[PDB]
């Protein structure tokens, strides 16, 4: 079965870092003359083929755009955890899905990205809090040391399914 | 950055790779 | 189901989004 996912958030929270991470299992830079945006899982028992598209953090109006969204089943919604203003846009992204999905029943996964940092502006509890209001799943990541980059993959995974 | 097309014998996972490759461009240059 | 046909050079990014569309709608087709 086939699963569209679909990155957002704002501006250098790392949305690229995990999509890389995720397919082909690296941080630091690498050159080789295409990269892939396809994954083939196996999730709970059942085996997946994920497509994920990695959006530009970059904003504009674009009916283009909002098309490409629509074909995601699933969004994770990223900030970085020494960013407040990347955390602060977190309801803007959802309204965003919410109008181009025309649902408020959308599979969502929060995640908090660059937990390996020295220093954190963003508290646990303050982002637990927002998604428990949102009633959608929070993920701790970092791209750099790969921590929690499959688990949140993967559990929005689940919530597409559950949907 | 645009994906090289396909190939007039790619197989449909070929196709599926290149699907992934092209929304992600499209979805950059608007 | 016709498979879509990859276009050229000179192709537009409206042309690509055409093919990006067709192809989605042979993909899902196909499976
Ligand atoms: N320490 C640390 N740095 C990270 C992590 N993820 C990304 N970065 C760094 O933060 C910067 C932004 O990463 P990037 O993947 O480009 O983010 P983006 O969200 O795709 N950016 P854009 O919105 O511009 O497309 C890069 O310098 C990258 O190395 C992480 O988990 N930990
Ligand atoms: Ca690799
Ligand atoms: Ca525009
Ligand atoms: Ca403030
Ligand atoms: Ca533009
Ligand atoms: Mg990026």
Excluded at chain 1, 7 to 17: D, E, F, I
Excluded at chain 1, 20 to 41: A, C, G, M, T, W
Aim: with cysteine.
């Amino acid at each position: 079965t086939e699963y569209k996912l679909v990155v957002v958030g704002a501006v250098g929270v790392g949305k690229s870092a995990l999509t890389i991470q995720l397919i082909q299992n690296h941080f630091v830079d690498e050159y080789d003359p295409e990269p892939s945006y396809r994954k083939q899982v196996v999730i709970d028992g059942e085996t997946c083929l994920l497509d994920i598209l990695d959006t530009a953090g970059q904003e504009e109006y674009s009916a283009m755009r909002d098309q490409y969204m629509r074909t995601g089943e699933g969004f994770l919604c990223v900030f970085a955890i020494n960013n407040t203003k990347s955390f602060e846009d977190i309801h803007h992204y959802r309204e965003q899905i919410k109008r181009v999905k025309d649902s408020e029943d959308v599979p969502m996964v929060l995640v908090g990205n660059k937990c390996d940092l020295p220093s954190r502006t963003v508290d646990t509890k303050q982002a637990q809090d927002l998604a428990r209001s949102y009633g959608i799943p929070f993920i701790e990541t970092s791209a750099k040391t790969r921590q929690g980059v499959d688990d949140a993959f993967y559990t929005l995974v689940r919530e597409i399914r559950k949907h | 950055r645009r994906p090289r097309c396909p190939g007039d014998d790619a197989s449909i996972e070929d196709l599926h790779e290149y699907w992934a490759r092209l929304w992600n461009y499209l979805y950059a240059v608007a």
